Enzyme design. Structure first.
Site, PDB file in Angstrom:
ATOM      1  N   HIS A  24       0.729  -1.246  -0.035  1.00 11.32           N
ATOM      2  CA  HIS A  24       0.076  -0.080  -0.147  1.00 11.32           C
ATOM      3  C   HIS A  24       0.994   1.476   0.052  1.00 11.32           C
ATOM      4  CE1 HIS A  24       0.645   0.672   4.418  1.00 11.32           C
ATOM      5  NE2 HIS A  24       0.737  -0.634   4.427  1.00 11.32           N
ATOM      6  N   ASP A  25       0.286   2.001  -0.694  1.00 10.71           N
ATOM      7  CA  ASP A  25       1.030   3.707  -0.678  1.00 10.71           C
ATOM      8  C   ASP A  25       2.394   3.660  -1.380  1.00 10.71           C
ATOM      9  OD1 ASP A  25      -1.305   5.149   0.894  1.00 10.71           O
ATOM     10  OD2 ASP A  25      -0.825   3.515   2.249  1.00 10.71           O
ATOM     11  N   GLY A  78       5.110  -1.072   2.606  1.00 13.20           N
ATOM     12  CA  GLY A  78       4.371   0.209   2.304  1.00 13.20           C
ATOM     13  C   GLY A  78       5.200   1.325   2.270  1.00 13.20           C
TER      14      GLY A  78
END
Lengths: 256, 257, 257
Positions: C120-121, C138
């Site tokens: 994520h991200d 992440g």
């Protein structure tokens, strides 16, 4: 309907109501799925597999497939999964082998990230977090509230007792005692999970006492028996030390 | 019927009557599957792929897909698989590149655990055991009766000769000679595989002689030529030493020591 | 006709006419697929996922699935993918979390080999090559023209700036500056990526100057500020040094030294 048409389910399998099985899933012989358990697309459920309630199993995960042990000759073996577990993509959990109780079991509230391998005859406790690409060899023991960093490898028969934390890309060849922080290749031990129980909000006296216990076991050059004998009086002054003593008594491969 | 209806098979593919193909499998152009071979659903068989008999291929395995070589421009390349192989989940075996005889070959009686990658133009012998998450880069050679530990990486062009054993989470940058035990990052030589020979029932004299050969090559600080000339003396009194000499002559990247 | 009947596509998803989606693919809510994009088979496209043109996504790849962050509570987050990307088997790219902009981005001309995880991200630039079994945690940043070796692990929030090269089986805990060559466990800086800028045809004076800059930063025992003010003199006689200065100013976790 909670079961997708393109899913193939054996007649002998039992699925509770409210359980959702997505497209292109396969469920094997004599397997059970609990209530409110959601299987996304492309999930394989092998034979002889019990799955609890409120589990979330993502795509391309093989749950309950045959062991990879060279001696396994296709006997009857089983896998048990508890409740409220998140099993991410590509995860592989294999059933036990008859040479060791013939079962693999994992507890509750676990997070198994992408490509987490759980080999035959493993035992996993509760509240555990296994990161990406973690491979756990057969007969291993994962305690409770354990964290294992990404791309780490646990050797066969190794014990990972409660509240420990394994760093990323670590090679675990020996047994990790409770509350221990291990990392590296080969993995070394460097301190305690102090900040973990601090972020859980435990009394500072307990943390200082446990710290002194760690110093006793590892950073004071004592043998196993002598350390154990040094843990005699501290147990009643602080009870949690018991979990550490167990680590020494259950350690059959040594320590870090 | 031995072929599941939901399986997609190109017309040019040949499947034996005794081969069973499960649900949601795809077989490509000009591919062949031998007798008594089990495809256990969600298996991709790429174009130009030959598969022997009594193979067991688990779900989500990509066998015979295009190479990952940046220079590969979609030419005609092939993959061959022998007999009695167990290929576990998520395994990826890629076809060769025309720049290196355009074929990837694996032998017989192999065990490829979860997520074992076999890159383009690799050559794998028989009775090999590659553990979980093992990635072997292109043009590598796996001998016979080899064990490679979990999450280990073999660099491109590296040779892994017979009866060796690579530890888990090891990085193989050079060539591993026969019977050698290598492990670490970067991996180093850590003695001889006496365990393999002791479970297979070899004469203690033979194991002691082979150990002395190892001491000659590695723990006697003499270069490759003087060592070679010293092993050619020992081949008479023990034949297996031959496999080690090959390792020295077949080494192009050097030796793991 | 370009979409296989057995593919499951949400009504809200937009697919271009020239995009081909193979068998057993699933596309989620509010997702978009560009022109001339190939989804071979067994591809998962999660909700809120944008995919550019001329992308090639192989089987068993999860593009746009929910994050693995323990605090992510099922909010609305997105994933963006550029053009001309080859995403190989078993690749997992997850959407962002609302705690950090709520988006995951990857650029153009990227090669993501087997089982490349993009958490994520993350933010990934262009012309990058991630080898097999690379896991990127992440909030990480991948620059442009970066190469990361197989089975390597990037820790969360780490910066991998442009023209760097991470060796195989490396563990990245800190930020890798531009043009840097890092490898090992724990990884360590091992000179400058001269091979890359020689392959790309750069003036030998420019490469020699950049190497002198590397000597200033790493091989001159200078703290970050004095090094910085020493490169601000060198930026004019050779402009590329700017990309290195950014690396020092954009470093929040330190530097791989």
């Amino acid at each position: 309907m909670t079961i997708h048409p393109t899913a193939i389910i054996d007649k002998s399998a039992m699925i509770a109501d409210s359980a959702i099985i997505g497209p292109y899933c396969i469920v094997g012989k004599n397997s059970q799925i609990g209530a409110h358990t959601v299987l996304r697309s492309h999930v394989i459920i092998g034979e002889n597999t019990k799955i609890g309630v409120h589990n979330d199993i993502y795509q391309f995960a093989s749950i309950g497939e045959n062991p990879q042990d060279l001696k396994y000759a296709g006997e009857q073996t089983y896998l048990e999964i508890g409740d409220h577990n998140r099993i991410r993509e590509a995860c592989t959990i294999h059933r036990g082998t008859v040479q060791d109780r013939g079962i693999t079991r994992i507890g509750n509230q676990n997070l198994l990230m992408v490509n987490v391998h759980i080999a035959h005859d493993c035992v996993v406790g509760d509240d555990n977090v296994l990161a990406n690409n973690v491979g756990v060899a057969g007969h291993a023991h994962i305690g409770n509230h354990v964290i294992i960093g990404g791309q780490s490898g646990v050797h066969q028969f190794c014990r990972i007792d409660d509240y420990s934390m394994v760093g990323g890309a670590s090679l675990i060849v020996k047994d990790v005692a409770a509350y221990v922080m291990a990392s590296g290749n080969p993995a070394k031990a460097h301190g305690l999970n102090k900040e973990g129980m601090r972020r859980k909000g435990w009394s500072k006296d307990t943390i200082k006492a446990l710290d002194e216990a760690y110093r006793l076991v590892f950073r004071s050059g004592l043998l196993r028996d002598e350390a154990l004998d040094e843990l005699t009086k501290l147990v009643e002054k602080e009870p949690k030390i018991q979990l550490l003593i167990d680590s020494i008594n259950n350690s059959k491969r040594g320590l870090v």
